[PDB]
Amino acid sequence: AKKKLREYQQRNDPGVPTGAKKKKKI
Amino acid sequence: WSVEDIVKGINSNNLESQLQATQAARKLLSREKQPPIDNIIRAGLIPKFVSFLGKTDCSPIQFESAWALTNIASGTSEQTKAVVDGGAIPAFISLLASPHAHISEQAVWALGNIAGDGSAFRDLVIKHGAIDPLLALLAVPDLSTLACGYLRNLTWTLSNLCRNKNPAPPLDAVEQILPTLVRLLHHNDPEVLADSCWAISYLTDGPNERIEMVVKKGVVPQLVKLLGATELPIVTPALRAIGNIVTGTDEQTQKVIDAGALAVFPSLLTNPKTNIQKEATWTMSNITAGRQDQIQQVVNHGLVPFLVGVLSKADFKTQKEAAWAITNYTSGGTVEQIVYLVHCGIIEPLMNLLSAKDTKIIQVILDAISNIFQAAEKLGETEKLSIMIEECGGLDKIEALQRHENESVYKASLNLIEKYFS
């Protein structure tokens, strides 16, 4: 069976990369 | 300034004083170390800033208020909620049409921060109608028409509208955004490419119908090309998107293979960036859960030695991802494919990993060993395999696992001992 990203993330978080969620303007 | 001096200027009957105080607020909220967001909120300044966004006459105070609100919305969920609660979402959508590109850009940015907070605010930005004016800013024949920073902001904000789960974005919204996403995925700017790949990675994580929507757009060859970029900020989301696609149907997985993705995996499975190598191993695990002809393409690309390598030496989490990839291979492969694993050296690194005390990985390894023995039984190779397992110290481990506390471990090891080592 195929395993979706949610299961990989449960095995491996914290630290699984993701895009920037919010950005502060300097 | 102090917040009191800002409030005094904001609450003056002089517009130039208001612009000056709003400017001082924007600088205070942009300072490096702990900007006083909450003191500005408690001062009641968000409704004034939102009012300023509507001052089409005084474009400087529109820009300064949009910047100040952007940096409040960059904070915690409670700080982003204070911005939404002040009516900012429709006020920013109205500003997308500003004749001043730098003010329109600031509104794009603020909307990205709001949508980035979570699925409810994402869907609320969509309900207020943000998608049509955002896409209209990108509806030019040549994307190099637009300023580079402008294009990067539009791409990032669109990616946050594609982001997050429980629930996923509305189907109609994803359908409306996707064609623009496909164009941006081919644009020659590294940050635009990265955030385009992030957007696609979000859209491809979920039910296979969501994968199908993206793959129907012809995006997989470009994703495979970006898989080979030198910029780690591009490879990371490109590999995530490819990894998501191969969690889908066999035909969806075949599109990744037909585009040539496997030729990149010798480098990905030895990449010194830990998360790249680990996610490439996870991706292989879902490919080796596919059809026997897809396992054969893994074989033909020479990737079994690379999986032996990851199992032999990698950080522990990555080794465990490789163990899963091997157990999937042994569950679905032909007898010929399975004993080829043994020829490539899988047994010794499998037995070495069985030193781990975690019940979960023990069961994964014992399942793989059982599947390999079943293939060896059909070929007449069980005695060769038994000798190999004994000679690397693996029999000692299996024999001792007959006295493990867990019933599933203890019965699997007993079964291997009775069938193959008596």
Numbering used by the authors:
A (entry chain A): 13 to 38
B (entry chain C): 76 to 497
From the reporting publication:
GM130, a non-nuclear Golgi peripheral membrane protein, has been shown to bear an NLS-like sequence, allowing it to interact with Importin-α13. Since both Importin-α and p115 bind to the GM130 N-terminus and Importin-α pulldown by GM130 is enriched during mitosis, we hypothesize that binding of Importin-α to GM130 during mitosis may suppress the p115 and GM130 interaction, contributing to Golgi disassembly. Our data describe a molecular mechanism whereby Importin-α modulates mitotic Golgi morphology via a Ran pathway-independent interaction with GM130.
Moreover, crystal structures of Importin-α with recombinant GM130 either carrying a phosphomimetic residue or a phosphate moiety and molecular dynamic (MD) simulations show that the phosphate moiety indirectly enhances the affinity of Importin-α for GM130 by extending the intermolecular interaction network. Superimposition of GM130-NLS WT and the S25D and phospho-S25 peptides in complex with Importin-α revealed good structural overlay. Interestingly, apart from increased intermolecular interactions in the minor NLS-binding site, we identified intra-molecular interactions involving S25D and phosphoserine in the crystal structures: Asp-25 interacts with Gln-21 via water molecules, whereas the phosphoserine phosphate interacts with the Arg-18 and Gln-21 side-chains. The overall crystallographic temperature factor (B-factor) of the GM130-NLS S25D complex is substantially lower than that of the wild-type complex, also implying that the phosphomimetic mutation increases the stability of the protein complex. The temperature scans (wavelength = 222 nm) for Importin-α in complex with GM130-WT, S25D, or phospho-S25 revealed that the phosphorylated protein complexes exhibited increased melting temperatures. The Tm was shifted from ~44 oC for the wild-type complex to ~46 oC for the phosphorylated protein complexes. The CD, ITC, and crystal structure data give complementary results, suggesting that GM130 phosphorylation indirectly increases the binding affinity of GM130 and Importin-α, leading to enhanced global thermal stability. Moreover, the phosphate moiety on GM130 does not directly enhance the binding affinity between GM130 and Importin-α. Instead, our crystal structures of Importin-α in complex with either a phosphomimetic or phosphorylated GM130 peptide revealed increasing numbers of contacts with the minor NLS-binding site of Importin-α and additional intramolecular interactions within GM130.
